Amino acid sequence: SMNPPAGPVRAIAEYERSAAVLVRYPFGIPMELIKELAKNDKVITIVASESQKNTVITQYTQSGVNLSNCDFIIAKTDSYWTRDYTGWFAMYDTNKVGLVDFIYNRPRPNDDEFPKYEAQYLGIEMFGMKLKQTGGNYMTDGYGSAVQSHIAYTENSSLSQAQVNQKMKDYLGITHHDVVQDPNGEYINHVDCWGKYLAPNKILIRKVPDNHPQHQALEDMAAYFAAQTCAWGTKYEVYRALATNEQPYTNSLILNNRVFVPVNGPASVDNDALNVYKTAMPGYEIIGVKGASGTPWLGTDALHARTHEVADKGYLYIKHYPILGEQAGPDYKIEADVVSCANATISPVQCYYRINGSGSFKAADMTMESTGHYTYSFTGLNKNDKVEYYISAADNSGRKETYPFIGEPDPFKFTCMNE
Numbered sequence: 528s529m530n531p532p533a534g535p536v537r538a539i540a541e542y543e544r545s546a547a548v549l550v551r552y553p554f555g556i557p558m559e560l561i562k563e564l565a566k567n568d569k570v571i572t573i574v575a576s577e578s579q580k581n582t583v584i585t586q587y588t589q590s591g592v593n594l595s596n597c598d599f600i601i602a603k604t605d606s607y608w609t610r611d612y613t614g615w616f617a618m619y620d621t622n623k624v625g626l627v628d629f630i631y632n633r634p635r636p637n638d639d640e641f642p643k644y645e646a647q648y649l650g651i652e653m654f655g656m657k658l659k660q661t662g663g664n665y666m667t668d669g670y671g672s673a674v675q676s677h678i679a680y681t682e683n684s685s686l687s688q689a690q691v692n693q694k695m696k697d698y699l700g701i702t703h704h705d706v707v708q709d710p711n712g713e714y715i716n717h718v719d720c721w722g723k724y725l726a727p728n729k730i731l732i733r734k735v736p737d738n739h740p741q742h743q744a745l746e747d748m749a750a751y752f753a754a755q756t757c758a759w760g761t762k763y764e765v766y767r768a769l770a771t772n773e774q775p776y777t778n779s780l781i782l783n784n785r786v787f788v789p790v791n792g793p794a795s796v797d798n799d800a801l802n803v804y805k806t807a808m809p810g811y812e813i814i815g816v817k818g819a820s821g822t823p824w825l826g827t828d829a830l831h832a833r834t835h836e837v838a839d840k841g842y843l844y845i846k847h848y849p850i851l852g853e854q855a856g857p858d859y860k861i862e863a864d865v866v867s868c869a870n871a872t873i874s875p876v877q878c879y880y881r882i883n884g885s886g887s888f889k890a891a892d893m894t895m896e897s898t899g900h901y902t903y904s905f906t907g908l909n910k911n912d913k914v915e916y917y918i919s920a921a922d923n924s925g926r927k928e929t930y931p932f933i934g935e936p937d938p939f940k941f942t943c944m945n946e
């Protein structure tokens with residue numbers, strides 16, 4: 528249809544549960560990357576025909592790819608930039624997952640048409656947001672914020688900024704459309720070449736040497752996010768990836784509990800960038816990925832550009848705003864909504880917690896106050912006790928999720944003040 532999705536709407540972040548990753552043949556990525564992806568995750572390869580599917584299968588077979596995780600969509604495409612032209616995922620109507628199409632900002636009509644085939648393959652509804660856009664210039668935090676470079680306005684110049692924001696609100700639930708002047712000074716003007724949310728409370732911003740002409744622009748961008756309160760209420764943790772030679776270190780893919788980071792030398796500088804991700808994202812497997820010689824990584828175009836995560840149409844979604852830092856008390860009550868997009872019975876919903884850093888985490892069942900709305904109150908705590916906690920839910924479709932996604936390795940932390 529030509530109507531927007533039934534609300535409420537919530538755009539899905541890249542670090543939420545993904546059912547798959549979407550890539551295209553003829554390839555722009557190394558076979559070793561496809562192999563590593565398919566070890567743990569479903570890889571959907573776009574091909575133009577049944578014969579082309581079988582050509583790809585032959586190559587996957589030769590390369591030892593886990594075929595059990597290889598799936599295909601038959602559709603014409605102009606390019607391998609699946610980041611930029613495939614559809615955007617959003618929850619809508621409380622418990623549904625939908626796809627949002629847009630006008631691809633390139634003269635690539637097959638790429639532009641592609642989202643309809645994606646929605647058909649996935650069995651989800653598609654909604655048409657009439658803005659000139661590109662996935663490389665889009666990221667959301669999963670809490671209603673999105674960051675884009677200025678082309679989101681300038682390539683939609685027949686609309687006011689207000690009208691652009693309103694389209695993002697209506698189709699994606701974006702209530703904070705953070706559009707900023709691109710700090711990189713190159714043609715492409717995609718956020719994925721300088722910035723990346725790593726979690727709702729973490730953003731990676733590119734850094735360059737002091738004498739690079741964009742040094743100050745990037746420092747100003749880092750400062751802007753560091754001054755900003757995030758969805759969870761704390762200031763963003765701002766991480767920096769140092770590009771000494773225009774390496775595309777921000778152009779990474781977060782797929783479930785792994786992070787694929789393009790690397791292109793020198794080795795020490797690549798390792799420094801991997802180390803930033805490792806520090807920022809405990810519990811994640813951080814993987815450096817060398818480029819293919821025929822389609823190498825570039826400053827403006829690397830791994831993120833040539834992949835697109837795919838949401839789970841049956842997503843078991845946990846909505847939670849954490850209690851963090853110095854908390855007054857005397858009640859320490861957490862609240863979470865849990866929605867099963869599989870329409871499955873949810874049970875159990877638990878708080879896993881640890882007090883003062885010792886032993887194992889302990890499970891307590893949360894109490895369902897009203898439909899889909901769960902709470903839990905931390906009892907018996909003394910002034911200055913430190914709490915680590917995370918939420919865990921399961922449903923009878925077999926799904927199991929934690930909040931945060933990674934769970935126990937990176938729990939929410941607060942301190943009981945009793946004041």
Ligand SMILES: NC(=[NH2+])NCCC[C@H](N)C(=O)O
Nearest residue numbers: 608610663717719827828832
């Ligand atoms: N998400 C990205 N960084 N995409 C890079 C796209 C590169 C391609 N040459 C273009 O300008 O269309």
Ligand code: NA
Nearest residue numbers: 629630631639
């Ligand atoms: Na499109």
